[PDB]
Amino acid sequence: DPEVTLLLQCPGGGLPQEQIQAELSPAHDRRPLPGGDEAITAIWETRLKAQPWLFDAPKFRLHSATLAPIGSRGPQLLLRLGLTSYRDFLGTNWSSSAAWLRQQGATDWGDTQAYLADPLGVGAALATADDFLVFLRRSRQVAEAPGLVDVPGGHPEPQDLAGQLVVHELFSSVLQEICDEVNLPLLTLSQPLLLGIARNETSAGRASAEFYVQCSLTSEQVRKHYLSGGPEAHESTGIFFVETQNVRRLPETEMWAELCPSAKGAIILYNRVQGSPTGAALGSPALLPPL
């Protein structure tokens, strides 16, 4: 799977909010482009002169994520975050010249991402009470991955002592994205666990945090809530469910070719961190069938 790389796999079956530190610093920002940020302004002006209803929005930037030594007490992850925007994304990661920017960043900074906006996404492996994961079909009208299968998620917008508020907004944002798109009540959702971070090599390496969330509703009840919103309540064009039993071998199915890279990242991390049992009971052959 060349279009997805794992940056981080979390220990312990996934990390809760209380175990993560963030450092939000202008040191973690994109570097100014070699010939100046005028090239970003030119792309933005061209776009607004065709679609004048578009608007910019701020985004968090992922610089790096360092895990503590496994089995240690205290905070287990440090996220190094900067600030970026939708405009900077369109002028860098989504530019036809994104590969040239990656080569220049390796040359100038020893960092293939130094000249890239790299907005941080969030996605969820969302499990039902009857042990299915939730999938969404993307519209054929969207710019990126039209018509492909996705999981719930989005790109959170800004508003350890500014740190703890930023981690809170990341965890809150994945629940809000589930409530807004799947039309579920907030009180049917568990607090998220962070599974890891995946990079989308088709979008010049921008990263998504991938979370596990459990819902107290069955697959039939989740379907009713999603559909009872009507066509204007969701950006997706359909919902469907796969048994967690069957998620284990999803990369061997015809579905795998239809999944967008950030959804591939969510499913690889679900299989490595929530699946893949380590103990004698769940690891026994009748419960973990060979092949």
Ligand X SMILES: O=C(O)c1ccc(NCc2ccccc2)cc1
Residues that bind ligand X (CB under 6 A): 86, 89-90, 94, 119, 143-144, 155
55 in a known ligand binding site: yes
- Rounded to whole angstroms, how far apart are CA atoms 23 and 161? 9
Displacement of CA 45 from its chain's centroid (Å): 28
- Rounded to whole angstroms, how far apart are CA atoms 206 and 276? 27
CB of 90 to ligand X, least distance (A): 6
CB of 233 to ligand X, least distance (A): 20
Quote the Cα angle for 249-200-270, to 5°: 35
157 in a known ligand binding site: yes
CB of 95 to ligand X, least distance (A): 11
Residue 274 region by backbone torsions, left for phi larger than 0, else alpha for psi between -120 and 50, else beta: alpha
CB of 117 to ligand X, least distance (A): 8
- Rounded to whole angstroms, how far apart are CA atoms 116 and 29? 9
* Closer residue to ligand X (CB): 90 or 175: 90
- Rounded to whole angstroms, how far apart are CA atoms 266 and 151? 8
* Closer residue to ligand X (CB): 27 or 143: 143
56 in a known ligand binding site: no
235 in a known ligand binding site: no
* Closer residue to ligand X (CB): 210 or 219: 210
Give the residue before each break in the chain, using a C-to-N cut-off of over 2.5 angstroms; say none if it is continuous.
Answer: 159
* Closer residue to ligand X (CB): 37 or 130: 37
Annotated binding site for substrate: 55, 86, 138, 143, 150, 155, 157, 262
Annotated binding site for Mg(2+): 177, 181
